[PDB]
């Protein structure tokens, strides 16, 4: 019964949900010969009430190099980057839900992702299978991908359909723990753009640049626009699309007018829809935000690791699209 | 650059789609530093594979890097694959009957990461990888539509087609097992359910504990009565706790018409789990190209250095006495 030494960066909603899920499932972990021990938990304010023992809280960065895993849920990009690099350089894996970090700091992190050191299932659609879904879809050649990747904005549109205001729905989504610390990221399409980038890199181009995604959000939408779409037989959603234009992959995020019977329109959670050759049309859906939903993703990766599987790899080379693709905007 | 020496067992619709997919996608493989080299294709009936590669009799597998099996049956493929597994050679298979019935012999190799079998449930639609990620949570209930032939038949009988006429149409389309009994009496669903249970909740789950029935009581009139009640009938494979133990069943179920499982056009797996919540995957569960996508996914999984599909490390406790 060896120690599994975990350094946890972040003690907010996700880090806490993680810490507690680990404790609750500690029995399950003995089935691999380990007992989880947290070396420490990086938090901003050690005085806040928190379901993590005081004795483990760290206000300043702590040495990571004795850890077996670093789990990162601390927010931002540059700071987590500088903290995880020394661990990665030492061959310590990282488990993360940090889609901005992966999207924006890929020059530094790609070499370690290539070595199977980075697990990030929870960085897209939380614990809903998304990266594992695309790992399987590698069996085919991608024709087109369209996803509703951002939970906060799905929630807002679902509530506006029911007549609720933008502002009301937003505030609710922040209370549910769906929104980013900057909710602009959610509502302007940027969070969906981060996630789209990561899907592109896994599936078709390991160097795909975040800056190439063309993103717009939901700031022009209102209950009246969604009610006019309901009368046309349509639902408006924020959709992240990857498709071929002139022999190159084009990535875009934008509101789209969907037929109301489409899988993407009827999904209650977040959703990822793929057409690929020769499989055909496949889709996955589930909760794409929240503390528990995200911790399920991080824990799934912890189990992937402990089972002996490596992390999520980028696509082994870039390849061009098989066909010219094209949903209608609002 | 290394040669990947592949022994393919089966030259039917699946074997053939797989052979052609591997050669068509040989550039994809060279991005892992390999070149695919088939040793031979074992064939039952002496298709879209060169005649010179066909083998009417079994061939030594021990110099293979990988064995791929899409032969069907149990004991014949088992005896052909076991010497390879004993030598540490991995197996990629779509053969759900084999895994469900010969688990006493196959489990120890599955536990060492030598068996890849995504294609064995819902073909190349993610099902085993979906549950691998769901292990982050604990299962409360699982329900799937795991057989394509019976989904086709029910869908056609909704439209007023008779059982026999839909089954023949399913047979032309290539969905049905060679004996359609395995489809229509729920057995094929019950093989697949067993495999899902062993991955997620109990690595010793016996195929014999699955309580399976098929679609033989169903007709166009029954499905129309269900439609008038706002329901669809489907053949559903369920996994749920009852008095402290996991139970597995296959049977026709009256579903709400707007349920994800009722609205799915292909196979579907629907789960509630703690703390994730409700998740769902759907896509084609049958067919040559669909199956071949699964087997090739597994090949790429293997070549990237990831092990095969592991059983659950230990039986898990049910959280809910459901139904
Ligand atoms: N703000 C994100 C959180 C989960 O990544 C969302 O709404 O999807
Ligand atoms: N006969 C099976 C093939 C897929 O394994 C079906 O109908 O689902
Ligand atoms: Na995910
Ligand atoms: Na599958």
Automatic annotation (TrEMBL), chain B:
Location of the Aspartate/homoserine dehydrogenase NAD-binding domain:
10-112
Q: Where does NADP(+) bind?
A: 10-15, 44-45, 47, 174, 177, 287
Q: Give residue ranges for domain Homoserine dehydrogenase catalytic.
A: 132-300
Q: Which residues bind Mg(2+) 1?
A: 24, 138
Positions annotated to bind NADPH: 11, 13-14, 44-45, 47, 96, 174, 177, 287
Cross-referenced PROSITE patterns: HOMOSER_DHGENASE (PS01042)
Q: Does the keyword Oxidoreductase apply?
A: yes
Q: Which domain of life is it from?
A: Bacteria
One Pfam family for this entry, by name?
A: Homoserine_dh
Which UniProt keyword terms apply here?
Answer: Amino-acid biosynthesis, Metal-binding, Methionine biosynthesis, NADP, Nucleotide-binding, Oxidoreductase, Threonine biosynthesis
Pathway info:
Amino-acid biosynthesis; L-threonine biosynthesis; L-threonine from L-aspartate: step 3/5; Amino-acid biosynthesis; L-methionine biosynthesis via de novo pathway; L-homoserine from L-aspartate: step 3/3
Entry binding sites for L-homoserine? 177
One Gene Ontology MF term: NADP binding
EC class of the enzyme, as a word: oxidoreductase
Q: Where, by residue number, does Mg(2+) 2 bind?
A: 118, 121, 123, 125
Any coiled-coil regions, as ranges: none
In this protein, the active site sits at 192
Q: For the region Disordered, what residue ranges are annotated?
A: 310-323
EC number of the protein: 1.1.1.3
The biological processes this protein is annotated with in GO are:
methionine biosynthetic process; threonine biosynthetic process
Show the catalytic activity: L-homoserine + NADP(+) = L-aspartate 4-semialdehyde + NADPH + H(+)
Family per record: Belongs to the homoserine dehydrogenase family.
Protein name (record): Homoserine dehydrogenase
- Which species? Thermus thermophilus (strain ATCC 27634 / DSM 579 / HB8)
Give the classification, highest ranks. Bacteria, Thermotogati, Deinococcota, Deinococci, Thermales
């Amino acid at each position: 019964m060896e120690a599994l030494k975990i350094a946890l960066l972040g003690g907010g909603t996700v880090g806490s949900a993680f810490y507690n899920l680990v404790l609750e499932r500690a029995e399950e972990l003995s089935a691999f010969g380990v007992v989880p021990r947290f070396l420490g938990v990086l938090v901003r304010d050690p005085r806040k009430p928190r379901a993590i023992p005081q004795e483990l809280l760290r206000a300043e960065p702590f040495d990571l190099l004795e850890a077996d895993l670093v789990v990162e849920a601390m927010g931002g990009v540059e700071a987590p980057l500088r903290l995880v690099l020394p661990a990665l350089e030492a061959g310590i894996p990282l488990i993360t839900a940090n889609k901005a970090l992966l999207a924006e700091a890929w020059e530094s992190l790609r070499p370690f992702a290539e070595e199977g050191l980075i697990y990030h299932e929870a960085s897209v659609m939380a614990g809903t299978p998304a990266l594992s879904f695309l790992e399987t879809l590698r069996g085919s050649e991608l024709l087109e991908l369209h996803g509703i990747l951002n939970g906060t904005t799905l929630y807002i549109l679902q509530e506006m359909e029911k007549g609720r205001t933008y502002a009301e729905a937003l505030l609710e989504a922040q209370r549910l723990g769906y929104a980013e610390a900057d909710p602009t990221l959610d509502v302007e399409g940027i969070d969906a753009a981060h996630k789209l980038t990561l899907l592109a890199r896994l599936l078709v181009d390991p160097g795909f640049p975040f800056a190439e995604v063309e993103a717009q959000g939901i700031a022009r939408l209102t209950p009246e626009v969604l009610q006019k779409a309901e009368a046309r037989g349509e639902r408006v959603r924020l959709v992240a699309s990857l498709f071929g234009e002139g022999g190159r992959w084009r990535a875009a995020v934008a509101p789209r007018r969907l037929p109301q019977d489409h899988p993407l329109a009827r999904a209650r959670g977040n959703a990822l829809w793929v057409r690929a050759r020769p499989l055909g049309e496949a889709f996955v859906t589930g909760p794409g935000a929240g503390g528990g939903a995200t911790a399920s993703g991080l824990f799934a990766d912890l189990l992937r690791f402990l089972s002996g599987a490596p992390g999520h790899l980028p696509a082994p080379r870039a390849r061009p699209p098989l066909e010219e693709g094209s949903w209608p905007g609002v």
